[model samples]
Target: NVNDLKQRLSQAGQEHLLQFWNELSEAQQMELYMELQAMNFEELNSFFRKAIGEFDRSSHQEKVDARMEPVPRQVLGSATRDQEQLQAWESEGLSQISQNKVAVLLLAGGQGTRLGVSYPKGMYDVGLPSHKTLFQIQAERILKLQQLAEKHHGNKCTIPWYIMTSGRTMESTKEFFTKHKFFGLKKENVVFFQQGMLPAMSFDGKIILEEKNKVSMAPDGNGGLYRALAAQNIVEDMEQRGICSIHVYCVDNILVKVADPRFIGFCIQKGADCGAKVVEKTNPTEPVGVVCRVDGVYQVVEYSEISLATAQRRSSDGRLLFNAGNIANHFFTVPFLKDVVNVYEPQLQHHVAQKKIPYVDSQGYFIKPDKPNGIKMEKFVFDIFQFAKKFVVYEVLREDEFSPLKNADSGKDNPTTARHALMSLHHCWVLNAGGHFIDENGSRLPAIPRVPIQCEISPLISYAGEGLEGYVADKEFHAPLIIDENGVHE
Candidate 1:
């Protein structure tokens, strides 16, 4: 047994994998042996070799930036401008939704670790008046969207929600959804799938051990969706359900429009195989990836991949040239998704992230590093953009669509900023509906500035600031207000 394992590890250049074999308990030794035996050492060796080499090519980004260009105007559309066009697109999208031809795939593989929570980010309650979590917010939107679409067709229709969870999040995510009764979605319509996990490795390519019987692993990244789909037969499931188009998005964006009909209609109208909903980058140096043509291939180029001067370069209109900030919101025809999983997934490269992986050291003592100690390989979900036969970028205003809940209480993109953004939008919605705020003394307030009306509207009542006039019009509401089915609660 030792001879076979030794030969395999030596071949893989990971002989150190069993350095503490004698220290492990008998059960741990048996489990570790099985894990080692199950691994394809040759493939593991090849992957590590390529991943290590990739980190060395710092010069390649300069060449990539040289070939970058703004997406052609023909391929660009706006959600804010062109009122007549937007109305048509919105109707078309609604038609598709009414016909049950669309589905929403949520990329919720990441945990709320950055948000300082041990649970999934989707479960986070961003300090709203109603105390609604991200999951409830999105689910309610789906429910309301279904009702809105059903109104157009006068028939019942369903938009299946496919949530992709990671190994660390799958159980809790499943339980949370179950406890909330799938947020009013049909039990079978809400599907949960887990993404693949890759073993974390040291800089020198040695696999890190979490314990004598376990290996350190992390989710393979959102890009793992391609493989996860194929392995899980998700496309077949979609085909069977008559789903032709899929709206895929990240879970952390508090303002995400789930199965947004307008965006779906725009792609269907353009006959686009793949589509991206981007926010225009007002700040030239904003650290967000931009959707652009890289040597004629549509892909997202990260902010660090381009120079400030290149990022600052403007057209005659004096706006940032590479301004289409990617929001990880995309639309894909089912055929395109199938093509990606079948043809391009294997060729996609892994991105190496320096992470602080807690592991059992040579002395068999569990140690967590203060700084990055090992590399975790990940594949971004957008890496498949290069394979699209027809691609389009649709721009939306950031304030209306793109506040990501990424960090903890302090700092940017934190709970505070996200909460403020949502409440501000809700306040603006009330204002636009001819609604005014009043104090406890029944006196109308000047405006929502110094008062900072803490208004929270449930998506069930007003999805994306619509249908609020009936609730707020000709009325004055107190601060810390919540609007739901039963009317306003202050």
Candidate 2:
């Protein structure tokens, strides 16, 4: 019976395969055949074999058991205290920039499909009081840091901004930046490179063909960052540029401290090759992956791996036992990164996802969503943390630094929530700076202003002595407003 089934299936597969190949255009067929021939069965088998052998339904439970064990608690407490440290770090970080020891690596490959935006997440407008796009906000921060480096150190800090993009967002990201003149940064200082992609797989872990010549791929999740870096020769690029330290972060975090020096200094001082910035778990039950030891080695244990009992466990000081929830912000030394590529590259785990991957059908015609598909093989950037002989976890305030725009209109973690968080942060800053409210009629308004005012503070504003004069002001402004000297709000 088994032999009969095998024979039938083999016949069917051959028929489909031949029909598909014959239907393709001559050029398309050749390309497709070549790519198919290039598939490295050895690599595919090696990864899946390990996954199959190690597949454990109880991995999550084991994680919980490990997290519940008594351990020392180290937490970054609150934004108020963190902000003070942050300012000091900014001072020191700016100095590092002057020495050309720091650079920015942005992980921005994916599109904003979940946010219902056709463009990149960095291009989304959060409708903040400033109405600045995500990219502009980040670029402005870079510009400020650059200026601080120059002013304090009397040197033009070459803090090159490197963006890791993918096939999907590369063109649009470049066009958007060019359209806005790179948000005032010199074009020469910014570089864009692409992350490597893994072919999508069927649920059974078979690669899905997208077209005659191409396989459908996703960016392999953020985990792929290290692999992408090595694959693209970014380490070589950084070496050539003399960049010693790199600050890597995602693009969607509006309040991220880009190129944070304290994080860098801490890593450097600790003689660590890899460092992670994290936030304390709001509660033991909070759904977040915690950075902790796995088998006496540092690793990020997925939230699923943490059990409720383990989550509730507390240290001697009564803090949550597993408190370090990764914020996806990191600092890595150049030498460490190089080591990752050389030694640790092979051990990175590849994750699997079920997707509606499309492929070409027999007769060379592209097929529609004919059946369910599964995607296999994604490497995560954090995989390199295991290689760090010394690693440090610095805590930050989630409210001020971790507003991710993952959803469009639903739940607490949506765009609306992200926008509110940004506005709240800005409001707090304004109120703290001895700011007062005034109406159009020149009347002093209540301490809490109801009407929202577009108060944008651009790096250019400070450079050109424009806008709020480094002070808070109430004026109607639109997106892309460029304030000039003489206090003119454009």
Candidate 3:
């Protein structure tokens, strides 16, 4: 087995791997062999080295990206809404949903490396009482929205759910969902596909080998979604399904509205090719992309791009001049996405990030670095904004959406924060809807800064809390709802 493998390696342009085979233990040798078998090692060194050279000459020197100045505050749209205007858009959105014209695209290619897990981030429970993963919560919302549209418009339709995963996560993600019965939706209605991977390089511009014959690699970033979709004929699939508008979002944002018709209809009604749902920055200094125009074209400007003076500048209404922060929620016309893959993808800029890549050494063993030892290149999904024929910015309340679960135990942006965010939202809904909360003994709960109950209503129960009217009719309200072997109980 060993001699045949050594012969195979040299024949495949990996003679270096054979030189280390004698040094590697039998287990390590087998690992290297399998890893190499899974990879096309031909020209890996040259490929990674060339990528590093270009990055040092190009991406490494990237400035504040002053493609143009930030678009004025006046040209931007507002999320602040009147009840009358909101209801009208809701009706319009419901009609589209009922007609089955809308589809949801999830950018879930991210693995749980940041969360210190081997599974996808969407599979995490985030310590919620329901113990539902991000996928479950989102799937439930889609089901509820589907029911709402059917109930309101008296029509039956399908809300196609398309998920874009990556090579590292596609299998486990598919397995997880299949085990959950596709989260209560038709299994066939849900689709799974993966994005492409780009090779990783060392600081010295050489490919880092995780095994004697394998080069380290990672996903090409969310921007790859456009190309991946095209390459896999997903673009054609959407067209055939009559899905024109795509509501694309990241997986970690726990509060994302699944295929909200209002956002989609807003773009359609305006004839805009691209629409972004943004929220006012938590603060002027908050590090989020700003929705603005440059050279008379719509784009998102990184917070680091504009100078401090510009960021601190205020408008007549006391709002930051460039305050609409991009929250990774977007509505893209199918045609625009196709054009993006065909015309704009190659031009998408790659952002370089330093990472601590583990690599095999000359002595035939692997070592994990404590500090950043290599460079990772990634492209953002937002970079395609430049290709929009018409771009619209729709602002929404931060509390209502945009809680990202990015870290493991950091007090912010982790499971704790995501749980608190949902709980707080549910609490606010109960108070404002004339609904009262009760405990196990049927005692009415008081309105406190932090309510001492864990009750959460699914979007199915009330899409946005308006349907809470008479929800407790003839039945007493219960506190501390929990879903488990005992089922969902209050």
Alpha-carbon RMSD of each model: 2.5, 5.9, 4.4
User: What's the residue-level lDDT of 459 in candidate 2?
Assistant: 42
Model 1 agreement with the true structure over 221-288: per-residue lDDT tens digits: 88889989998999999999999999999888888889988899999999999999999987887989
Looking at candidate 3, the ten consecutive residues that score lowest on lDDT are 480-489
| Residue 426 of model 3, lDDT score | 74
314-403 in candidate 2: lDDT tens per residue? 777788877878778988889988888767877665654445677876555777674555555666677777788767777777866788
TM value for model 2 = 0.81
Error of 1 at 32 (Å): 3.5
- Model 1 error, position 153 (Å): 0.8
Clashes of each: 0, 14, 1
Worst 10 residues of 1 by lDDT: 56-65
Model 1 TM-score? 0.93
lDDT of prediction 1: 0.87
User: Can you give the TM-score per candidate against the true fold?
Assistant: 0.93, 0.81, 0.84
- The whole-model lDDT of each prediction reads 0.87, 0.68, 0.75
**Worst-scoring 10-residue span by lDDT in model 2:** 69-78
Residue 334, candidate 2: C-alpha displacement in angstroms: 0.7
